[PDB]
Symmetry: D2
């Protein structure tokens, strides 16, 4: 048994829904394969998102952590390969912070690689008929920020944890006024469940 | 009670599945509100497709006809506004026909407008959380051919019939090797059923 | 010699430039082979654009007419195969009109085919290293309005004229705030010149 | 203060017969503008060997600034790269048949290197001339990223005074005749790179925008 902590973000302004949370919330308390899943919501706010993540880690003592966020415009479930040490916000987060050219960790490394077996994850999702691909940029907003902070916290304080980040597309209901790709909430939920089982069943990637 | 005939195409050019047929097949025999639905498959073949449609029309005597086809790359359910008198194929149909610069109907008009209340359809589909928009080009392959042939048949032989065409996106499992937008088969099916019910309930568009 | 009238639209929406006018403006007075070019600007306004085109048609008595317009988001020079009888405006025109579900010619045909040898045109443009393809929808805004009005005017009153429409991409200076494809004004201008010369050299298209 | 700026472009790859990165920087070899004195060299689209060729060009020119340029087919803007990652991950073989997968470029080296060029300034000066530009946060995992990372690694370990980075550019029109795709004219691309070289030569420090 591996305790798998999944996080999803709260609503960002304009959006009334944040599917990353709606999808992971459905998996809370699930026992799938060797995974025992718990889910916690994180604010779409720089700095504060990391403190909420630290408290969830303290609370659940996870073996595996998968943070989930929305990347509108994408067409596949996309596990992220790398997190970078930079907050570069084009619009403000939920509490008005709009960092520009800012280090996430003063003196920390320029990047952290994911600790999850993402190539296996991508393949198991595709095996089930859901598109997926590895991404090499998680952006520079709060999603990458949480990804970098997660890996920084793992590296400095809880190295036994295998953690990473996964971006998901919009769900159909978010694309009614301006056309854009989406995947249904059921498919995204199923893909995150597969990612959790896969990570729990395999430390090593293919 | 209006008899609604839906058609979907058979698998084409490498695909193993044609979602236009998988979706309409599910509605064969369904009765909802003023709609009594029947479905028939049509070959992705120029000229022969029109022969199969005419037989379906002869057999079912529909009041309304909605032909459905796949438009890979689109991200919304898209009812078509206009059919044009032209077969222009960049690749061969399923029987090797590759017409170029060819009239669909010698002496027929340059175009036919759809006979369905497509704005109503788009709105009812979006009210159910599924992306939809009117399209102004059905292409120049077998799908536009069937649309033009349908309208020419209606014009020629059964002017009280209300007919038209609706393109739909890829389903997820067709987008595993090359990234592209898709909508789930359940959502496409629901959208087509809404189109059928809406067309049966209203003769006039909004 | 064939006289080729080219038209380009003024800036619309929130643009400050319109590549269709910038490019055709450069070709006014150009002559090459069988073609002699004259250019006129048309306002991005429903109804009024057709009256302005009729005035240019009377002024110049052209043998060939190529109306040009901006199709932001496209990546190639795109001659249009078909004009449809419908004004369906997603945004208001330059004077505020925003027609919806409106016939352009009451009782006119649902569509008019282009009268230009567009396959020849796309091939001659690609021969020069510039991307081009036939388009089967010119939209339902002022560009398609003008294209339909032009073909209706030709069919009814001046069938000797070979006329049609060519959409072109944004030019680079229009994509500085939001990423979008563009073609340089030099390349667009060269393509339109090729289009004029080709149309003037051949009434018949290829297959 | 005059600055020697070494520009590099790649040879054609993947079925292409021209590579706008080399066609553009080639035109700037020997150019002088503002405080920039520009020299250009071609680099092969081959893992390992590309870095050896870059090191030879560096020895040869003793540049103050280095801007490696590559083609990013599909992009619609000139895009200076913010970051280089320690990974060779090839979806297709390079020009000599190498197709590394999951490979560290520098075993134990940092996961990434930031660019040393003033890229926010470069993007602004390019947009001021009416050419689209934007910062990119991924240079891919093919030979362009490989060259970018190897350049920042060489600067870091052996010549920290050099200001170096990478700029990806779109296809030129002639490469998009069979399948639609965005492009920028060779003239505009060449002008954008010239601007990048003059801007980097004129300013060690980047602006913040």
């Amino acid at each position: 048994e591996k305790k798998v902590l999944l996080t999803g973000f709260d609503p960002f302004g304009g959006e009334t829904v944040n599917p990353s949370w709606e999808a992971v919330k459905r998996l809370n308390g699930a026992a799938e394969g060797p995974a025992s899943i718990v889910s916690e919501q994180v604010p779409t706010v720089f700095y504060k998102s990391l403190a909420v993540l630290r408290e969830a880690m303290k609370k659940h003592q996870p073996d595996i952590i998968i943070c989930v966020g929305q990347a509108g415009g994408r067409m596949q479930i996309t596990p992220e390969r790398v997190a970078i040490n930079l907050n570069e916000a084009r619009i403000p987060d939920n509490e008005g912070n709009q960092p520009v050219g800012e280090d996430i960790s003063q003196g920390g490394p320029a990047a952290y690689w994911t600790g999850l077996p993402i190539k296996r994850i991508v393949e198991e999702i595709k095996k089930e008929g859901i598109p997926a691909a590895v991404s090499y940029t998680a952006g520079t907003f709060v999603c990458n920020h949480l990804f970098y902070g997660l890996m920084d916290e793992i590296s400095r304080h809880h190295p036994h944890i295998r953690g990473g980040f996964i971006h998901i597309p919009y769900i159909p209901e978010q694309t009614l006024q301006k056309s854009a790709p989406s995947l249904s909430l059921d498919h995204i939920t199923k893909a995150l469940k597969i990612a959790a089982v896969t990570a729990a069943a395999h430390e090593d990637d293919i």
